[PDB]
Structure formats: C-alpha cells, structure tokens
C-alpha cells in the first residue's frame, strides 16, 4: 500500500472574481480505489469530474479531479482525500501561491 501525494491548485494564476478551474492531483498511491472531494468552505462541491485512471513507472496510480471555480477573498477551497492507507480523510487547503 502506498499513500497518495496531493497537490491542490488552479489551472490559471488566480485573480479574485475571475473564473478559473480548481484541480486536485492525487498521485503515488496503491491500490487504485480512492475518494476525492473538492470543498468550498468545508462543503462538498457537486459538479466534480476526474481523469481516466493511469499509472507511473513504479505502478502507482494518478488522477486529476477538477471543477470550475471563481476565487474570492472570503471563500476557502480545499481537496479532501480518503484511501485505505489513511486513518482519517486528509484535507489540503488551496493556496493561490502554490
């Protein structure tokens, strides 16, 4: 079993009030079953899509989860991941500088 690595980021450099896309890239995990949600103010975002499962040279899997979003000064965005290797879901907050 290998635990997922997570990056949460925007497709384009963030500007408050300008529409964009919120990504959560999960990689380096095994087995492939995984639960990924994008959150807005701690609540699950409903329209979220993901890439088709693929894997790296070490056989670990990777997926991209994504949705449209409009960054603002007051909204907090995050990615929440659960996997067999995790005891509790891991929440990674979106920071526009990363």
């Amino acid at each position: 079993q290998r635990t997922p690595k997570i990056q949460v980021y925007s497709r384009h450099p963030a500007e408050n009030g300008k529409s964009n896309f919120l990504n959560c890239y999960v990689s380096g995990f095994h087995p492939s079953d995984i639960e990924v949600d994008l959150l807005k103010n701690g609540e699950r975002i409903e329209k979220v899509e993901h890439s088709d499962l693929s894997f790296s040279k070490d056989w670990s899997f990777y997926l991209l989860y994504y949705t449209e979003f409009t960054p603002t000064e007051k909204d907090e965005y995050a990615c929440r991941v659960n996997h067999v290797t995790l005891s509790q879901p891991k929440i990674v907050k979106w920071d526009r500088d990363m």
Binding site: Q7, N23, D33, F55, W59, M98
Partner: protein, 278 residues
C-alpha cells in the same frame, strides 16, 4: 523530436459481485487519445482527442474488440494469480499492463516495451531485446516458461517494431497541429516574505508541453539545493503541464539567485531573476 505510443490497462477484482473494474487508456507522447471504462455506458473504445475522431467505424469496432479481449485476459489472469499465490477468494487484487513503442526524430523504431504487474509489483516484463522475459518471482517464472512455449515474444516484437510504429506515425501526421507542436514553458517568479529578513522566491513554469522539464536554482552561478522545494510536474487540465521550484533567501540578497529552465520547446535554457521593484 522523439515520440511514443503507449497503452495502460488496470483491472481490479470485485469478489463480492461481478467482473473486475477495467480501465484502458492510450497516449501519444503526453496526450491521452482513447479510453475504455467497463463501468461506462457505451461499452466501446472512446475518442479523447480531436485527431482520432477522423477514424472510421472499422477502427472503433476493431479497437473495441481488442480492448474487450484484453479485459477478459485480465479477468482470467486475476483468477490464475490468486491460485499461484494461494490467496483467498475474498480480497480485491489488481493487474496492470503497459506496452508501447518509442521512435526517434526520424520517426524510426527506437525501443519497445511490455510490462505487467500484480498488486503493484513487477510480475513479468519483456526485455529490451524483445525476445527474452524478466520474471520477478517463481509464479512469474511459470508464466515465463508458458510464454516461451507459445511464441509470445515473437508476436509482441512484430507488433512493437511494426504495427505500433505504423499507428504512431499515422497519428503524428493526423494530429500534427498539436502532437508536433512544442509549448515552451511560460515562466515568472513570485516573492513571498516569510519574515522581515527572509523570503521565498518561487519560479513558475506554466502551460508547457510535453511534460518533461528541468527547473534548477543557482546562487552566484553554482547549483543550490539547500532550502529549496521542487513540486512534482502536474497537469493543468487543458493538456499542458505546470511545475514550480522555490528557494528561501535572506531579504536583500535576491539578485544572487537564478532559476534555470530546460525544456524541448526552448532552443536555449531560460534564466530568471527576481525583479526587485515588484
């Protein structure tokens, strides 16, 4: 430049009920162009790039027959492997397969490969000679003797050196507008104070294609790895990739630090420094 065509397959057993979950994807370089998902409604191989939609119904019928045959081979293999390893019928297990071919700048065959894994570990792989097999353990050694007796490597070698390269050249021509275009990284540097006397400089590479790239920091013209962070290259979601590299520096000393960017789309590597008025 050089190019590749690669197919990836994953099957995951579901012993409580039904057949394994099966997902197949095909790539040309870093571009996904076809997919199959056993859970999807069509039960067909589906297009994922505009240039493959040019293919007619005989292509889609042929690829659907081949991918469904691959799914059944994986279903049989999951059963055989459970027996080779004396495993319970109650647990979920996984098989993964990747194969494909590489061509050089002249679009001629460079190398082929066919690798197989059970539960995330190497099981059996074709060697670079396209004649021999690497078996990781004694269960894979049983499979190796079976495949030597059935002329498997000969059939794989014929596909990898012939058919695989012929399809790749066809796709490179039909999808030339994007497949043969390199997108050089769009670079910039950001500054993030961490105190009144230290700051992080972050060097960004955005919207590039293909994914291969190198970002390095130098201080006074020599490589710097202390106090640096380099994230894994990540998809933007529009077919291009992103990466960044960061270094923590004493405030006022930013001009000593340079970020160096190497990519196929850049004739000469780029050098960036922090613009102090910003």
């Amino acid at each position: 430049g050089s190019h590749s065509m690669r197919y990836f397959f994953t099957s995951v057993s579901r012993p409580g009920r039904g057949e394994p979950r099966f997902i197949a994807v095909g790539y040309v370089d870093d571009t996904q162009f076809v997919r199959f998902d056993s859970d999807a409604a069509s039960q067909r191989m589906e297009p994922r790039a505009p240039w493959i939609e040019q293919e007619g119904p005989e292509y889609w019928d042929g690829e659907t027959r081949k991918v469904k045959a691959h799914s059944q081979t994986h279903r049989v293999d999951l059963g055989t492997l459970r027996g080779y390893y004396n495993q319970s019928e109650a647990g979920s297990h996984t098989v993964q397969r990747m194969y494909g071919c590489d061509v050089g700048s002249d679009w001629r065959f460079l190398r082929g490969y066919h690798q197989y894994a059970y539960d995330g570990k190497d099981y059996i792989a074709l060697k670079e000679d396209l004649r021999s097999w690497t078996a990781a353990d004694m269960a894979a050694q049983t499979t190796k003797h079976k495949w030597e007796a059935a002329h498997v490597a000969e059939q794989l070698r014929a596909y990898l050196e012939g058919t695989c390269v012929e399809w790749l050249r066809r796709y490179l021509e039909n999808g030339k507008e994007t497949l043969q275009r390199t997108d050089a990284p769009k670079t910039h540097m950001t500054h993030h104070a961490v105190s009144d006397h230290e700051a992080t400089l972050r060097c960004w590479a955005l919207s590039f294609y293909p994914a291969e790239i190198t970002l390095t920091w130098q201080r006074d013209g020599e490589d710097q790895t202390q106090d640096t962070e380099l994230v894994e290259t990540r998809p933007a979601g529009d077919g291009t990739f992103q990466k960044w590299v960061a270094v923590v520096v004493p405030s006022g000393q930013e001009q000593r630090y340079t970020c160096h960017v190497q990519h196929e789309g850049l004739p000469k590597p780029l050098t960036l420094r922090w613009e102090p008025s910003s």
